[PDB]
Write a protein that binds this DNA or RNA. Structure first.
Ligand SMILES: [Mg+2]
Ligand SMILES: [Mg+2]
Ligand SMILES: [Mg+2]
Ligand SMILES: [Zn+2]
Ligand SMILES: [Zn+2]
Lengths: 171, 112, 180, 71, 350, 79, 108, 83, 721
RNA sequence: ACAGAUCGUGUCCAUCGAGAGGU
């Protein structure tokens, strides 16, 4: 599921910083920029590998001011929740709406209408969960969950999960 | 500190992110310290390259860049040898003056 | 921020062929035969759960070593693993780096292969088939017991692989994941 | 709330001695005073020019601070 | 190793050497408004009250012996550490590496009655008064929350006196040998914990002149080197320093940290960082040399030997003083050290 | 100098144009730092351009004339 | 004002006609009432020629659609659902020519 | 599309290029960019730019665009100034 | 828009900051829960001392859509409002909710007046409705419950207290982000007006030896005095959250209805950070060449005292000080000009300096005539208490019209009024600064003296007594007006249903509102007779014995209840201390400080009846709320640690100063009285709401800003240059 | 619970035709 793509970034540098350290300045700019990003097209950017031959091209100077625009070339590991993909995670939160999963850095929700009516909200047990037959599921337990689709392309990225599928739950 | 009253003065002071300051209504001049990166709208001083134009503008010689010299009378004064390219006389002619607003335009007007 | 220029009338295509699907139909950005920065006609790289963890770990230690050498020139099991990448992340990436902790924890908890030789030979074993690297990554990461689990897990392998070969390399992967 | 606002004044000393004008704007120690005969505006120290009455009478110095009135 | 608190001892005036109380503790309190204000640190120069060596010979370890005896009585067995030294004295021992012997002259006597090392202490005004004044307005008797406002107002113009000395005994192990050191506490910047380790709650303060050029900057760097060596010897979180000028007016108060000081010190000049490394290595080398040839006898009844250590010709000259010398008679035979109770406790351990 | 006279010394406007439609009908909310194009439900490619207000008025009038003056920030060539 | 959208320069302009679906898609309101300010000449009529969603009318208040004032709001386009199709005045000649070119009973 | 051994453009520096370089350097100096030459007490950014151009100490590259779309990069220090 | 809000906006700009509230999204009929553990875009927040009385009232009987349900709708509304504000603020250390309960006799009389009125207007509106159906059965009246029903001692207070505990238990059980959050609930049994308990708790927490000076606290409330209350406690990193009213969009007059619904569902909120306002005060109270030392800490308390003197909810406003928007500046400049004449300050931790107050009031009376003349001129110009002779200042006419007494009586009455007014000023200062001075002080007058009075108060001393808090039943009797028989004991109803001598005098049937005292709103004065102490106390104590034991059980003072989660750091220690010992007595009390987690205080075994391994029933029985167990929460009593000494207003050591978000230009603008008149540019406050972030949270390890020196200061200067 | 007189910054009077002019 993990992919590495040759992404591109455009940055603007003030001419007051036009010193011999422009290369390292752009390096740290990119480093703090793409780390932890939540872009809706590529997905989740986790690590920026290949910290060599970044190949910072010449910076075209805008006619308006002295700033220069740079087009840096880099590769990084991406993370996108492709719809219809089976993934395995851990339970973190479980309200009456459903039990969430911790597949990667996301908050995929398994809403009550997705999995069958077998799962019941039993609040008597100390950890609030959906204790039922066909194996035991609880908080911080192994669970395999499918992805129905992608929502909220802007801001945070997450999806919705379902368990109603043969050889998908329990495990 | 001179203010917008004498010729060698300023009219506006621009701080970061706009926020224009007026030097004729605020009167707070003198007790204001100019930090680096600000902009000051000073008056047009001597040796300032400006664009001097006469209409109709047929050829490129109708547009010229001159050097500002402040004079104590309310009229435009020019050398007698530049009237021929302008095709202008002094029987009541009217001519326009344009000033640059950036280093790019000032330098390109001076050098071109 | 993009890597592919407009083509096939991207301005007003007006097709809207959904957004994603389980039976291939990958996104436009993640399409086969990607364009490399200097090269061209390079297929998309797919990483398994174990491969991605090794990649990020090796990148992190390389960056830490580079930073340490720059400073010098200027001048158990799962429990032990958590301390290692904790102390690696606490000084290499810097910043908030809140999102990185969860990804690394999930990679360590759900890691299938922990031996360099085994993960290296995984690609050699899987290169026999001409399957799309995404589904081979899915079968390498997700566990299985026989052909039924692999067939039911994803809908992209309908009659694309012979059952005998499918069960053969499924048992091969089963032993290659149970040996470590 | 400056007292020297809209009051008939006479300029003393300098090159405009004896001129009659009305204060228009005050900018700190400097104030803008128009002129009756001359069609121009001049700026001088507010403490210098004397102050007269709108209708007409005796003239006084800048001591009008203690008496917020005309004359 | 990580320093561990052993106990707390108080040495008030008149040589009373009280044990196990916090009557000589101070708390830091200095609002930024006071720093902004033009405080004077030279008023009332005639109000100085001195209870130091001039009043009586403070060069003794009777209080330290009493407090370690009390700690051993409370706990039992024998402390594994082999060298006892005052916090101030130990700093001067290693300061001779980069300081001339004339500037740093140290006279000490050792005792090996316990099969260990027992260091005995052996013996301008305006600057001292200004430092004491800065300490007085930089400290509070009781905690601020329990301090009335009128007490603060009186303190802002209080007299200058010497006292309220807080001594803490800390066992610090460096290398393969364990050492016990008697630290000095001046103020408590943060909160105070009762019946718990307060090493992280301690602090250290001093005064220095304002810099004008790079020479004064280098002098301040050397002072920071000395105080960082001090802190590394004891373990102190706060190294707050005061700044004074020609007019003796407080200007700036800083908040240096133990970990931050070496990094900035090395970043400024590589030479001082190399000196730091050389000093921290030389301290261990000197300790390992001291624990090498000194005759240690665990038998209490064994004959005690007295030594004198003088740093001459870049070497530590150690020689055993003859028993017929009057110094030994006035030290051991005269019962200057090794009190009757301490000797009784030592014999009980046998 | 021509550009400065036409823009800085005269009308100067900033508008947001959708990267798919090419029109200026983009809903921009600077308070929440988000943009949206209701025409093609686009939210991840919005560009800002600096054009004179007269040009914006002319484009709006042309759009009122059932004519679409789509503006693009990239050159269309080859494939 | 600061906008996170990247700043670019126009490189080409593509002309064309406006499809009947596109105008409805981009329209923010539907105009049906031909009278404006019908609320006792105090406020603006909803759905009229001066709909608030069309844009701000005075600087102090903001535009409901995008929440800026006049100096920043570029305005928004509405639409009118014509009862019957109407010939374009500027395309009458082109319509006649293309009708002559093609058959009047079949598209061939 | 950046040939070097096949650069057929003139090695000299045009008046428009000179004006643009001087203006850009002057604007950068005015907005507090680092200066690589001593000023001799000068205080006008434009004359500082001319002084820098005199000894060829301007770190800029001229990109001359061919009509088809290709281009070649010429350094400021390698361009002969004769006008 | 309220005058106070715009006044503080124009006098102190760049203070109001918008809330970056996250908008939940619903897709495919599924609403994604909000991530509580996510970082708050509005800055880090630790404490959320909140007033529940200011949130329950707006939900009940609003200007539109009244709640038809008796209690279910109100409980749902308060629950959703609490959830919204908690998500908006996102606390991380401690959340405290307070409910108004027993108050001092002063607030007592005031509330009496207020409610009695509310009852009168409710009677007017319901009789108007009755005649409305007359001119058209009894089911169409739609008579909602009166606002007087919200009073401690009523069963509604018990229902609210029960609902809050269940709500917080459900939130703690269902939210993984509440692992390290402590919830303190103060029901109506505990005396206080909602904010007094808050400041008492803040002062008690500040007295802890391990208290962190860098803790950030936020208070939610629509009251107009809590802004000055936050400055009175001298606690930096203080932010005030309130609903925005500057917009004031059009109310209700398809897709239009849905847009209007979402507009109401997204009401914005504004920040009122005072850390950046502290700089505003510091650049305002400076005095040129003052004799004694000057510090910001002593200046803010004096300003708070002056603001309280302008107008307080306890004492009536002065006749000269009625606008409370412009006279504040007048008295501020009077204090500034008279400060050099004094060799000391004005207030010292609540202690009032008599000569300073005497000089201030003498100067105010000297300036009183000019202010009265200017206000008369303004009123006459606007036009172009029955008798007012403006030439002599109508002092005698005012006395004879507000008291109807003879000259000797007016002299003795002015003396008594001065005495009681200075005593009340001292009492309100003492209450708002440190604890409560007295629970029995009252003002036996309906007005306040003016002019050249107050000059004879110098030869006096202030001395109060602790007293005892009032019981819920006597307070309910004192505050509740006539009728309003709901939520009342049967004994009180029987006492009402008989023509008693004290019933008619203390609680008549018609409130004379002829005293409008120069105003044009519900605002008025209390013409109701001042209820005495002995008669009401004897009546209540005589009616007590025959009350049922079950009803009499609701007469305990009570204690705040702690509801720490099951994953708290101190949870194991508390369980071991209070359950392993199984002492079965109220003697095991712990003294954990603020070093571990937070919430320094003393706890004790719960007296409500909480048990381990049990279950908690839903109090409202509506909405199908899940039934949780006691294995995830702990209900235990909490007690405030008594203050060892007076709450001295001294900044705690180690406090990190706030970075200046403010330039020196506006500093000198306020200092020199530049005003916005010189700034002819349109100062759009709406545009002033866009470009403000106001970072909150300590900046830098060092607690001292650079003030030259050497080493680090020299390096900083070189970097700046 | 809480629950405001204006204050403080304030933007201009436009369009269409007709005539007389001057370089
Ligand atoms: Mg002519
Ligand atoms: Mg000291
Ligand atoms: Mg109140
Ligand atoms: Zn679009
Ligand atoms: Zn708009």
């Amino acid at each position: 599921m993990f992919f590495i793509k040759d992404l591109s970034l455009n940055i603007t540098l003030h001419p007051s910083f036009f010193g011999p350290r422009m290369k390292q300045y752009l390096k740290t700019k990119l480093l703090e920029e793409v780390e932890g990003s939540c872009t809706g097209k590529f997905g989740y950017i986790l690590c920026v590998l290949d910290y060599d031959n970044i190949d910072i091209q010449r910076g075209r100077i805008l006619p308006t001011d002295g700033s220069a625009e740079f087009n840096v070339k880099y590769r990084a590991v991406v993370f996108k929740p492709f719809k219809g993909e089976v993934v395995d995670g851990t339970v973190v939160s479980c309200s009456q709406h459903g039990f969430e999963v911790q597949v990667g850095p996301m908050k995929v929700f398994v809403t009550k209408h997705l999995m069958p009516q077998d799962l019941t909200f039993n609040a008597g047990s100390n950890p609030p969960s959906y204790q039922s037959s066909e194996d035991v599921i609880t908080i911080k337990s192994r669970i395999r969950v499918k992805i129905e689709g992608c929502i909220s392309q802007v801001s945070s990225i997450h999806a919705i999960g379902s368990i109603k599928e043969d050889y998908l739950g329990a495990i | 500190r001179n203010g917008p009253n004498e010729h060698p003065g300023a009219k506006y002071v621009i701080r970061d992110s706009g926020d224009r300051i007026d030097l004729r209504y605020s009167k707070r001049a003198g007790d204001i310290q100019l930090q680096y990166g600000w902009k000051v709208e000073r008056h047009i001083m001597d040796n300032d390259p400006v664009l001097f134009n006469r209409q109709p503008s047929l050829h490129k010689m109708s547009m010229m860049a001159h050097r500002v010299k402040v004079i104590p009378y309310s009229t435009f004064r020019l050398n007698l040898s530049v009237t021929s390219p302008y095709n202008a006389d002094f029987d009541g002619d009217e001519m326009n003056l344009h000033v640059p607003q950036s280093e790019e335009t000032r330098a390109e007007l001076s050098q071109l | 921020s993009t890597s592919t220029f407009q083509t096939r009338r991207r301005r007003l295509k007006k097709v809207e062929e959904e957004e994603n699907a389980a039976t291939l139909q990958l996104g436009q950005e993640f399409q086969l035969k990607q364009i490399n920065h200097q090269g061209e006609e390079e297929e998309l790289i797919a990483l398994n759960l174990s491969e991605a963890r090794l990649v990020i770990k090796e990148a992190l230690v390389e960056r830490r070593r580079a930073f340490k050498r720059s400073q010098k020139k200027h001048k158990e099991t799962r429990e032990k693993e958590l301390e290692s990448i904790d102390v690696l992340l606490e000084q290499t990436t810097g910043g908030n780096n809140k999102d990185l902790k969860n990804t690394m924890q999930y990679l360590t908890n759900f890691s299938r292969f922990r031996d360099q030789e085994t993960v290296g030979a995984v690609i050699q074993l899987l290169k026999s088939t001409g399957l799309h690297p995404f589904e081979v990554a899915q079968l390498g990461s997700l566990a299985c017991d026989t052909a039924d689990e692999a067939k039911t897990l994803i809908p992209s392998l309908n009659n694309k692989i012979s059952d005998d070969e499918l069960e053969r390399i499924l048992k091969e992967l089963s032993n290659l994941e149970t040996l470590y | 709330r400056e007292v020297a606002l809209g009051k008939t004044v006479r300029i003393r000393s300098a090159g405009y001695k004896g001129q009659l004008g009305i204060v228009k704007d005050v900018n700190g120690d400097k104030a803008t005073v128009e002129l009756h005969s001359k069609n121009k505006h001049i700026t001088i120290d507010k403490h210098k020019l004397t102050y007269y009455n709108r209708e007409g009478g005796e003239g006084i110095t800048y001591d009008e601070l203690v008496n917020r009135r005309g004359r | 190793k990580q320093p561990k608190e052993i106990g707390f001892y108080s040495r008030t005036k008149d040589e009373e050497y009280l044990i196990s109380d916090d009557t000589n503790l101070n708390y830091y309190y200095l609002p930024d408004a006071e720093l902004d204000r033009k405080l004077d640190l030279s008023s009332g120069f005639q109000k100085f009250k001195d209870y130091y060596k001039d009043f009586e010979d403070r060069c003794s370890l009777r209080g330290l012996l009493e407090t370690i005896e009390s700690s051993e009585r409370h706990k039992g067995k024998k402390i594994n550490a082999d060298i006892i030294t005052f916090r101030g004295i130990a700093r001067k021992l290693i300061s001779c590496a980069f300081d001339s012997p004339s500037f740093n002259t140290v006279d000490l006597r050792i005792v090996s009655f316990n099969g260990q090392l027992f260091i005995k202490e052996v013996p301008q005004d305006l600057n001292v008064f200004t430092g004491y004044k800065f300490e007085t307005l930089a400290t509070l008797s009781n905690p601020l929350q329990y301090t009335p406002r009128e007490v603060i107002e009186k303190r802002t113009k209080r007299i200058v006196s010497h006292g309220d000395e807080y001594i803490s005994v800390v066992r610090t192990g460096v290398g393969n040998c364990k050492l016990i050191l008697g630290a000095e506490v001046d103020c408590i910047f943060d909160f105070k914990e009762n019946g718990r380790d307060n090493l992280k709650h301690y602090a250290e303060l001093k005064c220095t002149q304002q810099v004008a050029n790079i020479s004064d900057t280098h002098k301040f760097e050397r002072k920071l080197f000395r105080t960082w060596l001090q802190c590394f010897l004891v373990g102190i979180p706060r190294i707050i320093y005061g700044f004074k000028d020609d007019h003796y007016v407080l200007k700036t108060v800083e908040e240096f940290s133990t970990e931050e000081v070496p990094v900035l010190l090395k970043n400024n000049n590589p030479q001082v960082g190399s000196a730091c490394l050389e000093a921290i290595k030389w301290y261990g080398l000197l300790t390992e040399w001291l624990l090498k040839m000194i005759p240690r006898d665990e038998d209490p009844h064994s004959q005690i030997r007295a030594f004198k250590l003088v740093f001459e010709n870049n070497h530590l000259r150690l020689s055993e003083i003859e028993e017929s010398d009057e110094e030994y008679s006035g030290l051991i035979d005269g019962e200057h050290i090794l009190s009757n109770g301490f000797k009784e406790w030592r014999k009980s351990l046998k | 100098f021509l550009k400065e006279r036409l823009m800085e010394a005269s009308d100067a406007f900033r508008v947001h144009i959708c990267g798919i439609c090419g029109l200026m009908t983009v809903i921009a909310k600077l308070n929440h730092n988000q943009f949206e194009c209701k025409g093609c439900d686009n939210k991840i490619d919005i560009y800002q351009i600096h054009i004179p207000y007269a040009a914006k008025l002319l484009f709006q009038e042309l759009m009122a004339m059932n004519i679409t003056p789509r503006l693009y920030t990239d050159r269309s060539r080859d494939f | 004002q600061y906008s996170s959208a990247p700043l670019r320069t126009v490189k080409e302009v593509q002309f064309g006609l406006f499809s009947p679906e596109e105008v409805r898609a981009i329209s923010v309101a539907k105009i049906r009432f031909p009278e404006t300010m019908d609320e006792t000449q105090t406020r603006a009529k909803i759905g009229g020629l001066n709909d608030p969603r069309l844009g701000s009318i005075d600087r102090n208040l903001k535009c409901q659609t995008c929440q800026e004032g006049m100096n920043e709001c570029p305005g928004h386009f509405g639409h009118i659902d014509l009862a019957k199709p109407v010939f374009h005045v500027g395309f009458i000649a082109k319509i006649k020519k293309v009708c002559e070119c093609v058959c009047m009973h079949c598209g061939k | 599309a950046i040939p070097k051994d096949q650069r057929a453009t003139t090695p000299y520096m045009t008046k428009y290029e000179r004006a643009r370089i001087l203006g850009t350097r002057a604007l950068q100096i005015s907005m507090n960019a680092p200066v690589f030459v001593d000023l001799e007490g000068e205080t006008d950014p434009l004359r500082i730019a001319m002084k820098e151009l005199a000894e060829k100490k301007i770190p800029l590259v001229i990109r001359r665009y061919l009509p088809d779309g290709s281009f070649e990069d010429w350094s400021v220090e390698e361009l002969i100034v004769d006008l | 828009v309220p005058s106070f809000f715009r006044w503080l906006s124009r006098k102190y700009p760049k203070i109001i900051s918008p809330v970056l509230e996250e908008q939940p999204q619903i897709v495919d009929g599924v609403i994604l829960p909000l991530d509580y553990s996510a970082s708050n875009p509005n800055g880090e927040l630790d404490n959320l001392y909140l007033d529940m009385n200011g949130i329950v009232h707006p939900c009940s009987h609003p200007e539109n859509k009244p709640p038809p349900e008796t209690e279910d709708e109100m409980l749902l509304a308060v629950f959703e409002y609490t959830n919204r504000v908690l998500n908006m603020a996102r606390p991380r250390k401690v959340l405290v909710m307070a409910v108004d309960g027993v108050a001092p006799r002063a607030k007592m009389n005031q509330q009496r007046a207020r409610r009695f009125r509310s009852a009168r207007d409710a009677q007017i509106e319901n009789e108007a409705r009755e005649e409305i159906m007359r001119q058209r059965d009894a089911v169409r009246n739609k008579k909602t419950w009166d606002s007087n029903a919200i009073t401690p001692g009523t069963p509604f207070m018990d229902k609210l207290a029960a609902a809050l505990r269940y709500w917080t238990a459900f939130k703690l059980a269902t939210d993984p982000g509440w692992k390290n959050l402590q919830v303190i609930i103060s029901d109506a049994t505990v005396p206080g007006e909602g904010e007094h308990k808050i400041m008492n708790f803040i002062r008690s927490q500040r007295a802890d030896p391990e208290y962190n000076p860098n803790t950030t606290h936020c208070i939610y409330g629509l009251d107009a005095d809590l802004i000055f209350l936050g400055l009175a406690t001298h606690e930096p990193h203080f932010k005030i959250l309130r609903e925005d009213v500057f917009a004031q969009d059009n109310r209700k007059r398809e897709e239009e209805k849905q847009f209007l619904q979402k507009q109401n569902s997204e009401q914005p909120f504004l920040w009122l950070h005072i850390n950046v306002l502290r700089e505003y005060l510091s650049a305002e109270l400076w005095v040129p060449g003052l004799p004694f030392t000057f510090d910001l800490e002593r200046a803010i308390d004096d300003w708070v005292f002056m603001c309280f003197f302008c107008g307080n909810d306890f004492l009536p406003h002065l006749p000269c000080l009625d606008v409370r928007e412009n006279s504040i500046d007048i008295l501020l400049d009077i204090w500034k000009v008279v400060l050099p004449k004094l060799k000391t300050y004005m207030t010292c931790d609540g202690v009032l300096n008599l000569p300073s107050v005497e000089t201030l009031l003498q100067h105010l009376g000297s300036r009183e005539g000019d202010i009265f003349k200017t206000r008369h001129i303004q009123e006459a110009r606007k036009k172009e208490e029955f008798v007012k002779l403006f030439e002599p200042g109508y002092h005698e006419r005012y006395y004879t019209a507000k008291f109807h007494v003879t000259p000797q009586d007016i002299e003795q009455l002015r003396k008594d009024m001065v005495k009681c007014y200075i005593e009340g000023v001292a009492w309100v200062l003492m209450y708002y600064y440190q604890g409560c001075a007295s629970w029995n002080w009252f003002y036996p007058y309906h007005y306040a003296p003016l002019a050249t009075d107050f000059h004879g108060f110098s030869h006096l001393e202030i001395k109060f007594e602790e007293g005892t808090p009032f019981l819920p039943y006597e307070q309910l009797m004192s505050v509740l007006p006539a009728a309003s028989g709901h939520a009342l004991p049967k004994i009180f109803r029987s006492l009402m249903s008989e023509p008693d001598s004290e019933i008619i005098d203390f609680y008549p049937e018609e409130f004379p509102i002829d005293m409008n005292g120069k105003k044009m709103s519900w605002q008025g004065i209390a013409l109701l007779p001042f209820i005495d102490q002995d008669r009401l106390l004897t009546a209540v104590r005589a009616q007590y014995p025959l009350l049922s034991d079950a009803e009499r059980a609701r007469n305990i003072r009570g204690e705040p209840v702690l509801l720490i989660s099951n994953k708290n750091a101190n949870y194991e220690r508390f369980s071991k201390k209070l359950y392993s010992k199984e002492n079965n007595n109220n003697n095991v009390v712990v003294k954990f400080q603020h070093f571990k987690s937070g919430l320094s205080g003393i706890v004790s075994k719960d007296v409500e009846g909480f048990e381990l391994n049990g279950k908690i029933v839903c109090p409202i029985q509506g909405g199908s709320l899940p039934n949780l167990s006691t294995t995830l929460i702990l209900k235990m009593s909490y007690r405030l640690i008594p203050l060892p000494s007076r709450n001295k207003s001294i900044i705690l050591n180690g406090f990190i100063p706030s970075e200046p978000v403010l330039t020196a230009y506006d500093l000198d603008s306020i200092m020199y009285k530049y005003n916005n008149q010189n700034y002819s540019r349109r100062w759009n406050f709406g545009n002033d709401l866009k470009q403000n972030i106001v970072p909150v949270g300590p900046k830098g390890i060092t607690q001292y800003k650079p003030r030259t020196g050497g080493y680090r200061a020299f390096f900083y200067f070189a970097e700046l240059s």
